[PDB]
Design an enzyme around this catalytic site. Structure first.
Site, PDB file in Angstrom:
ATOM      1  N   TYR A 150       0.829  -1.180   0.000  1.00  0.00           N
ATOM      2  CA  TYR A 150       0.000   0.000   0.000  1.00  0.00           C
ATOM      3  C   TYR A 150       0.874   1.244   0.000  1.00  0.00           C
ATOM      4  CZ  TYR A 150       0.967   0.924   4.905  1.00  0.00           C
ATOM      5  OH  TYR A 150       1.659   1.221   6.065  1.00  0.00           O
ATOM      6  N   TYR A 203      -9.810   8.454  11.450  1.00  0.00           N
ATOM      7  CA  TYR A 203      -9.422   8.810  12.835  1.00  0.00           C
ATOM      8  C   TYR A 203     -10.298   9.902  13.448  1.00  0.00           C
ATOM      9  CZ  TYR A 203      -5.315   6.083  11.485  1.00  0.00           C
ATOM     10  OH  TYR A 203      -4.517   5.067  11.073  1.00  0.00           O
ATOM     11  N   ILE A 261      -7.931   1.011  10.476  1.00  0.00           N
ATOM     12  CA  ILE A 261      -9.078   1.910  10.364  1.00  0.00           C
ATOM     13  C   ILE A 261     -10.264   1.204   9.678  1.00  0.00           C
ATOM     14  CG2 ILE A 261      -7.873   4.098  10.607  1.00  0.00           C
ATOM     15  CD1 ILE A 261      -7.990   4.303   7.515  1.00  0.00           C
ATOM     16  N   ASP A 270       2.887   7.316   3.802  1.00  0.00           N
ATOM     17  CA  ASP A 270       3.308   6.026   4.352  1.00  0.00           C
ATOM     18  C   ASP A 270       3.255   4.999   3.204  1.00  0.00           C
ATOM     19  OD1 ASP A 270       3.836   3.885   6.309  1.00  0.00           O
ATOM     20  OD2 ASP A 270       1.620   3.677   6.541  1.00  0.00           O
ATOM     21  N   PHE A 318      -5.654   6.208  -0.034  1.00  0.00           N
ATOM     22  CA  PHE A 318      -4.806   5.016  -0.116  1.00  0.00           C
ATOM     23  C   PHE A 318      -4.868   4.365  -1.492  1.00  0.00           C
ATOM     24  CE2 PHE A 318      -3.404   4.127   4.265  1.00  0.00           C
ATOM     25  CZ  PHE A 318      -4.355   4.818   4.972  1.00  0.00           C
TER      26      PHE A 318
HETATM   27  C1  LIG Z   1      -7.445   5.564  17.477  1.00  0.00           C
HETATM   28  O1  LIG Z   1      -7.482   4.492  16.511  1.00  0.00           O
HETATM   29  C2  LIG Z   1      -6.287   4.112  16.068  1.00  0.00           C
HETATM   30  C3  LIG Z   1      -5.154   4.877  16.134  1.00  0.00           C
HETATM   31  C4  LIG Z   1      -3.975   4.410  15.589  1.00  0.00           C
HETATM   32  C5  LIG Z   1      -3.899   3.205  14.902  1.00  0.00           C
HETATM   33  C6  LIG Z   1      -2.563   2.828  14.318  1.00  0.00           C
HETATM   34  C7  LIG Z   1      -2.506   3.100  12.823  1.00  0.00           C
HETATM   35  C8  LIG Z   1      -2.999   1.952  11.930  1.00  0.00           C
HETATM   36  O2  LIG Z   1      -2.964   2.492  10.589  1.00  0.00           O
HETATM   37  C9  LIG Z   1      -4.043   2.276   9.827  1.00  0.00           C
HETATM   38  O3  LIG Z   1      -5.031   1.722  10.235  1.00  0.00           O
HETATM   39  C10 LIG Z   1      -3.905   2.823   8.397  1.00  0.00           C
HETATM   40  C11 LIG Z   1      -4.188   1.694   7.454  1.00  0.00           C
HETATM   41  C12 LIG Z   1      -3.100   0.641   7.412  1.00  0.00           C
HETATM   42  C13 LIG Z   1      -1.845   1.352   6.971  1.00  0.00           C
HETATM   43  C14 LIG Z   1      -1.482   2.516   7.865  1.00  0.00           C
HETATM   44  N1  LIG Z   1      -2.595   3.471   8.103  1.00  0.00           N
HETATM   45  C15 LIG Z   1      -2.416   4.776   8.336  1.00  0.00           C
HETATM   46  O4  LIG Z   1      -3.413   5.441   8.669  1.00  0.00           O
HETATM   47  C16 LIG Z   1      -1.043   5.401   8.284  1.00  0.00           C
HETATM   48  C17 LIG Z   1      -1.148   6.867   7.791  1.00  0.00           C
HETATM   49  C18 LIG Z   1      -1.622   6.956   6.354  1.00  0.00           C
HETATM   50  C19 LIG Z   1      -1.768   8.417   5.875  1.00  0.00           C
HETATM   51  C20 LIG Z   1      -0.397   9.140   6.016  1.00  0.00           C
HETATM   52  C21 LIG Z   1       0.041   9.090   7.456  1.00  0.00           C
HETATM   53  C22 LIG Z   1       0.160   7.611   7.955  1.00  0.00           C
HETATM   54  C23 LIG Z   1      -0.402   5.315   9.619  1.00  0.00           C
HETATM   55  C24 LIG Z   1      -0.981   5.814  10.734  1.00  0.00           C
HETATM   56  C25 LIG Z   1      -0.250   5.710  11.983  1.00  0.00           C
HETATM   57  O5  LIG Z   1      -0.830   6.189  13.119  1.00  0.00           O
HETATM   58  C26 LIG Z   1      -2.065   6.843  13.087  1.00  0.00           C
HETATM   59  C27 LIG Z   1       0.940   5.103  12.060  1.00  0.00           C
HETATM   60  O6  LIG Z   1       1.610   5.065  13.267  1.00  0.00           O
HETATM   61  C28 LIG Z   1       1.386   3.828  14.034  1.00  0.00           C
HETATM   62  C29 LIG Z   1       1.556   4.592  10.955  1.00  0.00           C
HETATM   63  C30 LIG Z   1       0.801   4.659   9.711  1.00  0.00           C
HETATM   64  O7  LIG Z   1       2.747   4.017  11.111  1.00  0.00           O
HETATM   65  C31 LIG Z   1       3.185   3.002  10.168  1.00  0.00           C
HETATM   66  C32 LIG Z   1       2.378   1.786  10.379  1.00  0.00           C
HETATM   67  C33 LIG Z   1       1.821   1.081   9.387  1.00  0.00           C
HETATM   68  C34 LIG Z   1       1.034  -0.109   9.395  1.00  0.00           C
HETATM   69  O8  LIG Z   1       0.950  -0.723  10.701  1.00  0.00           O
HETATM   70  C35 LIG Z   1      -0.210  -0.581  11.412  1.00  0.00           C
HETATM   71  C36 LIG Z   1      -0.678  -1.585  12.204  1.00  0.00           C
HETATM   72  C37 LIG Z   1      -1.881  -1.403  12.882  1.00  0.00           C
HETATM   73  C38 LIG Z   1      -2.677  -0.297  12.790  1.00  0.00           C
HETATM   74  C39 LIG Z   1      -2.192   0.751  12.040  1.00  0.00           C
HETATM   75  C40 LIG Z   1      -1.029   0.561  11.382  1.00  0.00           C
HETATM   76  C41 LIG Z   1      -5.071   2.440  14.732  1.00  0.00           C
HETATM   77  C42 LIG Z   1      -6.253   2.948  15.242  1.00  0.00           C
HETATM   78  O9  LIG Z   1      -7.478   2.397  15.168  1.00  0.00           O
HETATM   79  C43 LIG Z   1      -7.675   1.374  14.272  1.00  0.00           C
END
Ligand SMILES: COc1ccc(CC[C@H]2OC(=O)[C@@H]3CCCCN3C(=O)[C@@H](C3CCCCC3)c3cc(OC)c(OC)c(c3)OC/C=C/COc3cccc2c3)cc1OC
Length: 128
Positions: free
Chosen positions: A45, A101, A75, A56, A118
């Site tokens: 992705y 978020y 998400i 990202d 995305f």
């Molecule tokens: C309060 O709710 C949450 C807060 C934080 C999380 C952790 C982030 C989660 O990321 C995502 O769900 C989406 C979709 C899968 C790829 C990453 N992603 C992001 O939103 C990206 C974001 C995309 C737009 C440009 C900025 C970065 C993201 C968000 C983050 O925090 C909000 C990250 O920090 C943890 C981030 C990557 O770091 C790299 C991690 C990547 C994939 O690993 C993940 C594993 C589990 C959940 C998520 C990510 C999950 C949450 O709820 C589900």
């Protein structure tokens, strides 16, 4: 990505039909099958904020990204969107904050009330 083209041509894949997740298929997949709840999903992705200030990519960690479909690990837009995908598909998703978020975001990465974009390539998926 072409968020105007997704705004203009995208499919609303939300239950409520509130246009909160809009999908384009950019590449058609080779499978008829879409994944089930709990399947281990493997993707590549790239994502961004609509404001173009944060980015990202699965490639940033040199490995496919893995999650469990429909378990709230990612998400809501992902659980919703990847469930509609076949193996090999590449889709674009434009996502309103209600499916990402919301009001508090996730600082510093995610501001309040952020729209996301995305690109997802579904590589494979496997039961439980
Ligand atoms: C309060 O709710 C949450 C807060 C934080 C999380 C952790 C982030 C989660 O990321 C995502 O769900 C989406 C979709 C899968 C790829 C990453 N992603 C992001 O939103 C990206 C974001 C995309 C737009 C440009 C900025 C970065 C993201 C968000 C983050 O925090 C909000 C990250 O920090 C943890 C981030 C990557 O770091 C790299 C991690 C990547 C994939 O690993 C993940 C594993 C589990 C959940 C998520 C990510 C999950 C949450 O709820 C589900």
């Amino acid at each position: 990505g072409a968020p105007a083209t997704v705004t203009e041509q995208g499919e609303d894949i939300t239950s409520k039909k509130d246009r909160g997740v809009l999908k384009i298929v950019k590449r058609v997949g080779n499978g008829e099958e879409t994944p089930m709840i709990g399947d281990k999903v493997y993707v590549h992705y790239k994502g961004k904020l609509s404001n173009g200030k944060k980015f990202d990519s699965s490639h940033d960690r040199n490995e496919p990204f893995v999650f469990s479909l429909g378990k709230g690990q990612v998400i809501k837009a992902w659980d919703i969107g990847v469930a509609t995908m076949k193996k090999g598909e590449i889709a674009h998703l434009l996502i309103k904050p209600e499916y990402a978020y919301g009001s508090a975001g996730s600082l510093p990465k995610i501001p309040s009330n952020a729209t996301l974009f995305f690109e997802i390539e579904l590589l494979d998926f496997k039961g439980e």
